Design a protein around this ligand. Structure first.
Ligand SMILES: COc1cc(O)cc(/C=C/c2ccc(O)cc2)c1
Ligand SMILES: COc1cc(O)cc(/C=C/c2ccc(O)cc2)c1
Ligand code: NA
Ligand code: NA
Ligand code: NA
Ligand code: NA
Lengths: 116, 116, 116, 116
């Protein structure tokens, strides 16, 4: 899996299910071009975003709609979304797992990068 | 001081000093307009970004240049920046403290929102 | 898996491999009785700590030797260990995943609790 | 003030006020001796726990009573407490700020260590 995103709920102690996100790749003119998208499964995971051959060097942005997640639970959260912006594949292919841990007024994110 | 940002270094156990950041505000055409910028002090804090009169309702983005911070220490980090995007002052004026805790492959951010 | 522990390295962007931990259960006299132990795999995970029938209500402590992990990388960390203390199984069996994200001067921990 | 503790609430976006904590110091027989205790103020801070003369080299544990904090808000949290165990002052006197960011099923802790 070249790119996987895992989202956890720090309030309820559960995967964060049905969390929507879009992935963009920065174009030569500094605009954000659409690249991938999806929503998390019952395990809190989103797999299948891209393929190795399509996922080349670039600056990528994962924009996670955390606000909709909290609003569906009746909570007015702080953030509009959680963003993760990173250069990928600049030393050739790697496998990336982006994890996000969500609370209404806070998020934490980490990456695991593995060489195939 | 209705907006303050504090940045901590989870590797060295210190404030994150001389970290640059830029603040943007979403315009009516949905573009990001420059709003303020600055660098953290020896305490890891950036004060004086705005004023009560200038800090109107809106969607704001703080982009913290974590990449330059790590690179100056000889570390090639994961993220291009740490981002915080939030609606401010929509129920009247509030004071916001944004805190960020930085590691090379992870960051955590929280907000403290107070009604004066 | 009644109890699994997953450990991640926020500095290197990797699983934290070969991290040792012991699990204790609080006895009636408030002392900590040995309960389980192991070290993380190449995936950063420790499975097989207990079985459903052995893992009953109690206060459990997972004591993770983070200091040895950092010292092996030539780093003098802040914490002696990372501890996670929690009541488990007070409403009957659950499955617990404890995750820890490590930096030299910081750790973050979360739990995912699932009803079988 | 060589030891200060600051506690933040990631759910409400506020300092964590009136949070109790106890500090222990490891004795020569490896038992935990009571060292100091207190409660956080309206700013989420606990100052005045110790003095330069009293805060000798040793292994210290801060146990923050997060369980009572969440229960008072009607939340049944995961952890019994948030724990920070560390060696202090082994290379001479330092000033320590321990920060903790709390959610019902997660906590994050960091240290800022300064040489006066
Ligand atoms: C005065 O020392 C301070 C002041 C302050 O406003 C915040 C913090 C810590 C914030 C923080 C963020 C994220 C984390 O994961 C863990 C702590 C420490
Ligand atoms: C439960 O299974 C998993 C799989 C995984 O890849 C990561 C995590 C936790 C990530 C995480 C992020 C931020 C934090 O502050 C603390 C943990 C948990
Ligand atoms: Na390259
Ligand atoms: Na309004
Ligand atoms: Na019960
Ligand atoms: Na010494």
């Amino acid at each position: 899996c070249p790119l996987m995103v895992k989202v956890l709920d720090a309030v309820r102690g559960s995967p964060a299910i049905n969390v929507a996100m879009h992935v963009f790749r920065k174009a030569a003119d500094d605009t954000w071009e659409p690249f991938a998208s999806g929503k998390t499964s019952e395990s809190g995971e989103l797999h299948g975003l891209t393929t190795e051959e399509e996922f080349v060097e670039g600056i990528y942005k994962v924009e996670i709609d955390t606000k909709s997640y909290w609003k569906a639970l009746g909570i007015s959260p702080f953030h509009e979304h959680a963003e993760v912006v990173f250069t990928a594949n600049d030393s050739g292919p790697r496998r990336y797992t982006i994890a996000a841990l969500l609370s209404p007024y806070s998020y934490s994110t980490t990456a695991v990068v593995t060489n195939p």
